[PDB]
Amino acid sequence: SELDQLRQEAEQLKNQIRDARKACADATLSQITNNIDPVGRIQMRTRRTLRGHLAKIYAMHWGTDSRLLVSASQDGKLIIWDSYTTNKVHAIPLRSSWVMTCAYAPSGNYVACGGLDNICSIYNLKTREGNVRVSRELAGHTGYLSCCRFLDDNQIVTSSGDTTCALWDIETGQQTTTFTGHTGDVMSLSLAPDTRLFVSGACDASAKLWDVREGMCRQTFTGHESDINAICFFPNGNAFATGSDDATCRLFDLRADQELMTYSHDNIICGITSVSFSKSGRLLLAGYDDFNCNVWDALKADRAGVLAGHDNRVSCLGVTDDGMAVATGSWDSFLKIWN
Amino acid sequence: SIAQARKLVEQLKMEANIDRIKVSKAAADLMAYCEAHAKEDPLLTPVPASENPFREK
Amino acid sequence: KKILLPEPSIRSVMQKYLEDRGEVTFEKIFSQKLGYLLFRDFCLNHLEEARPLVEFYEEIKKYEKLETEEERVARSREIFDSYIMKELLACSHPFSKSATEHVQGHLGKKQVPPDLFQPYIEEICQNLRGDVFQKFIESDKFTRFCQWKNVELNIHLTMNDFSVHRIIGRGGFGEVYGCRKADTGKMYAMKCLDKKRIKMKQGETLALNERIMLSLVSTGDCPFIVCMSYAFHTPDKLSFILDLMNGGDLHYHLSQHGVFSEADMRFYAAEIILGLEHMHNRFVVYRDLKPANILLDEHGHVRISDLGLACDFSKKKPHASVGTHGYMAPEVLQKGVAYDSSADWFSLGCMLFKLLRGHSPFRQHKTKDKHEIDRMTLTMAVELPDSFSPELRSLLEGLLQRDVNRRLGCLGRGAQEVKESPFFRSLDWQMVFLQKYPPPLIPPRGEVNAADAFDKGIKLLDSDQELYRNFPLTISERWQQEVAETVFDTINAETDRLEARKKAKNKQLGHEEDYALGKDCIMHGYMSKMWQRRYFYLFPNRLEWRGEGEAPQSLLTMEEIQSVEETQIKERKCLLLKIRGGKQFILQCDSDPELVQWKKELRDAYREAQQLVQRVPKMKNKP
Numbered sequence A: 001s002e003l004d005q006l007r008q009e010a011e012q013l014k015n016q017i018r019d020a021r022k023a024c025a026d027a028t029l030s031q032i033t034n035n036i037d038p039v040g041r042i043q044m045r046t047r048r049t050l051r052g053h054l055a056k057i058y059a060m061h062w063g064t065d066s067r068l069l070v071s072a073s074q075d076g077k078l079i080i081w082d083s084y085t086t087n088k089v090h091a092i093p094l095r096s097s098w099v100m101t102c103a104y105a106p107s108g109n110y111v112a113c114g115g116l117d118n119i120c121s122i123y124n125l126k127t128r129e130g131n132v133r134v135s136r137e138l139a140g141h142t143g144y145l146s147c148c149r150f151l152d153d154n155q156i157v158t159s160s161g162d163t164t165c166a167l168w169d170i171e172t173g174q175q176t177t178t179f180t181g182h183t184g185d186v187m188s189l190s191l192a193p194d195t196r197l198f199v200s201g202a203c204d205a206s207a208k209l210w211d212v213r214e215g216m217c218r219q220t221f222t223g224h225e226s227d228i229n230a231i232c233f234f235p236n237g238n239a240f241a242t243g244s245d246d247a248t249c250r251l252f253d254l255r256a257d258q259e260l261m262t263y264s265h266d267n268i269i270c271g272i273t274s275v276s277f278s279k280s281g282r283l284l285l286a287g288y289d290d291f292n293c294n295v296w297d298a299l300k301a302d303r304a305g306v307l308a309g310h311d312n313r314v315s316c317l318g319v320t321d322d323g324m325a326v327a328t329g330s331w332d333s334f335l336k337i338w339n
Numbered sequence B: 001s002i003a004q005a006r007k008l009v010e011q012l013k014m015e016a017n018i019d020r021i022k023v024s025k026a027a028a029d030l031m032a033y034c035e036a037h038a039k040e041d042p043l044l045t046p047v048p049a050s051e052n053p054f055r056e057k
Numbered sequence C: 001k002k003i004l005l006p007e008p009s010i011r012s013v014m015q016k017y018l019e020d021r022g023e024v025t026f027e028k029i030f031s032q033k034l035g036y037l038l039f040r041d042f043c044l045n046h047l048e049e050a051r052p053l054v055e056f057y058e059e060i061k062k063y064e065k066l067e068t069e070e071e072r073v074a075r076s077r078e079i080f081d082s083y084i085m086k087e088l089l090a091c092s093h094p095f096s097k098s099a100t101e102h103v104q105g106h107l108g109k110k111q112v113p114p115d116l117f118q119p120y121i122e123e124i125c126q127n128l129r130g131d132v133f134q135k136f137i138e139s140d141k142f143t144r145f146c147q148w149k150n151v152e153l154n155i156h157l158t159m160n161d162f163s164v165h166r167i168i169g170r171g172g173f174g175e176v177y178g179c180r181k182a183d184t185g186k187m188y189a190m191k192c193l194d195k196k197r198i199k200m201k202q203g204e205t206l207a208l209n210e211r212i213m214l215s216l217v218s219t220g221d222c223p224f225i226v227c228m229s230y231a232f233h234t235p236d237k238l239s240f241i242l243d244l245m246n247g248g249d250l251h252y253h254l255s256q257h258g259v260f261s262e263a264d265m266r267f268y269a270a271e272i273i274l275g276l277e278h279m280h281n282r283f284v285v286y287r288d289l290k291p292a293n294i295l296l297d298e299h300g301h302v303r304i305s306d307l308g309l310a311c312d313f314s315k316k317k318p319h320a321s322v323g324t325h326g327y328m329a330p331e332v333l334q335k336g337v338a339y340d341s342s343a344d345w346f347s348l349g350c351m352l353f354k355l356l357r358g359h360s361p362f363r364q365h366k367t368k369d370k371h372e373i374d375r376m377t378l379t380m381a382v383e384l385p386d387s388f389s390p391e392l393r394s395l396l397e398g399l400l401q402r403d404v405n406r407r408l409g410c411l412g413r414g415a416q417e418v419k420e421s422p423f424f425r426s427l428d429w430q431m432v433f434l435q436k437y438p439p440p441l442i443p444p445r446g447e448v449n450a451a452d453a454f455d456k457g458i459k460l461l462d463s464d465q466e467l468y469r470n471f472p473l474t475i476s477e478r479w480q481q482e483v484a485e486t487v488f489d490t491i492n493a494e495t496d497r498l499e500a501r502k503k504a505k506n507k508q509l510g511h512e513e514d515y516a517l518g519k520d521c522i523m524h525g526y527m528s529k530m531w532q533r534r535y536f537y538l539f540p541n542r543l544e545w546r547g548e549g550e551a552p553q554s555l556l557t558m559e560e561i562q563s564v565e566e567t568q569i570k571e572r573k574c575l576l577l578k579i580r581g582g583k584q585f586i587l588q589c590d591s592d593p594e595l596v597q598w599k600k601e602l603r604d605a606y607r608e609a610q611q612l613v614q615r616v617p618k619m620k621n622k623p
């Protein structure tokens, strides 16, 4: 039939892609990195505890100044903190209690958040009057908002449980591009350093590389055996890491078009909730449902350290742009800055 | 059903026809990136309390 | 002892409570006394579009009460030629062509019945329902309705709520006292039946049936029945709060005064007839009409009392032979023969005979054997003496027929037949109803033992008290009427000031914002938690609470909550919340509508939250 041919040629193209990928697999990253010294033991202390949320924390995002951060909570608020003094700059109660994500505009002028309301709300931080007010409610997804990241003050990418991501024009309130392809809830996204590309991780156990301008999917990356809950780009933009419900993180190279490494331990059986790289890319920090953040050697795959300071799930984390600190957020309602 | 399967065929066509580099090149570039920025990474190369805003800067 | 209204935030709970019951409609609120009073205040003082509609409504309501046709001829003219009429005829929503044509048609012909303007009332109300009502619901006059309604629905009377005075009656099961309600100062009769005695003589079913019948009859403000406002009880007493009648019964007074003339009888018969008509219109047969059951007030006006033997015939006409023996109709004496209200028209004749002669017409020579009195009723016709006038004779011949088929009051028009007797040809029944006729016997002030009937080993089980658990009652119409005629206006004025002062003060202190607003808060209000009294805010995923002087710093997530159950603590119903960690959370509410609503909303909240959180990968618990 017609569906007979399409289906068998699509499976034939998949073998072709797999064949081409294997043709590139001439050496591994672990072989290539055998001669560089181990990282040794990464031991950080808690420098700040950020106290204030009255319930579980679901997300956090650092400011580009490496000082202010926004966090979102089960208590139905965003709090913006000064990590240096621990003082709250703003505490923003939300219209929906079911918030799940937040984001800080690179300029520092806006934050965004959303969740089960299926809306990405934008909050103007520096109102002409002086207040913090909701400046735009981006409606359009037909499922929960899982992640959102600003490109500038008038563009944001969002991911959703409706299995799509989208680019928005904030002024018009309209989706400029819709990114369709995932066959499961999209759980996380990460913008490439240039913001021409981004990657998403879904409950279909795959990650995808999207062209923001053209709006198409360029590459699809498989390997994980369960939900990808978290994704992050390597600092130079040519690879990214994912963290999954299968208790592994993995490194994927965009130009070799395949997985380079797996970060796992037989000890570690719980899911990963958050991933982030250190400034140089050498450390991969991942947050776990066993209350820890494990620090991996991105090049050699050994675990370099543990940040063990929360009494429930580490639900989110982020390294500052200046490299100075990691923030971990938790179901215990605290954020801690480690250094 | 039939529109969907053609849609998937054309996507896989796009994905299949791209230029790939050897994992040895890819891996070498990542390693080289890390070595170049190793000393500018404070979580790797711990800074003096003086330079640390969470201690004594 | 005075009434303290709840704070206006009580509206959060009360509006949901009332709305779940369908009690927030135009008809349901407008037809309540305090509802009408708060709605008219809103329309008269806070909404121009509605003001003249309500002004006119009230003019028509004053017109309806005008007693004489001359008054109504004068007033209908004034109303049609009035400024409000010209407002309502010259505006955006005027009266219809046919409504104005109908009224103007009757008006031009000088037929001015009490319901001349009923087409106008109906059109007014069709315009008050819709946007004007919804605007009332939004206003703070509905908030005040919620505050009063909260108080109504949390009435738990005890004896300490009454200042009880002298005894004004005595019977087999208890006594009646003059008393004053402390809330409002309203004077009432308190009939305290003794529970030990009730089980002794086995008259619980009589005590229970009196309550049911009183509630069936105690609406509509009948001037000729002793009606109930409240029923309550204490460990050993059943108590009815009733219309105060401190003038003794017609048994005492008949015996004191001796027999009454036809003229004096005609006063009592008229007032009794209107009392019966009331009950019969609510499908209640009284069954025990006799002079001991006719009370007098301070002025000599009479009311029917003691509904314990009465019966509802709206669904099942009775058959049992119930009553006092000189006064029971043929169809009642015959078991198996079902009867209805016809039973009372026979007992009236018997009783009206007694007032004249001094004995029931079937109790010849004071014959005390009950079988004698029964067969007399059934077998023979009564020979009414030559003393009696032809009109009194046609009356009693009519009322004492053995055939319901040929008996006065039973030919398909009821009281309107007994009212038409030539015996009552002098009476204006409107004047009777309005109690305008001079009574025959003004009782001597402060007389003793004027309402007495002819007449430690026992323990009350918890099974006995289970008979009385649905005994307490409050007749809404009665309590709202009592409050309106006493404390409503002044309490409303005091509360307005007390809330104004709290607003100003909250302005200065900086705390202006309502934490409940602009969010997805479901409901809020005070409760006590285990005891600290906190203000609570329920949201879809959590319950937060605060003290005074700060926004909430503590909460309980819906995913933590395993069950919400009712629980007794020191004779107070509490909510016991079971929390995930084998932990407990107990809540105490300040009123019963709150307990009910808080239990409902928490159950809905946590069930629905836990349902949802489970479909959300980032939010749910994983292995």
Ligand SMILES: Fc1ccc([C@@H]2CCNC[C@H]2COc2ccc3c(c2)OCO3)cc1
Binding pocket: C168, C169, C170, C171, C172, C173, C174, C175, C176, C189, C191, C192, C193, C226, C242, C243, C244, C245, C246, C249, C292, C293, C295, C305, C306, C451, C452, C453
């Ligand atoms: F428990 C009992 C007390 C008294 C009796 C009385 C027995 C004699 N005949 C009339 C009976 C009702 O007496 C009254 C008197 C004043 C009232 C009243 C009823 O209701 C409003 O104010 C019956 C039962």
Ligand SMILES: [Mg+2]
Binding pocket: C318, C319, C320, C321, C331, C332, C333, C334, C335, C336, C337, C338, C339
């Ligand atoms: Mg019978």
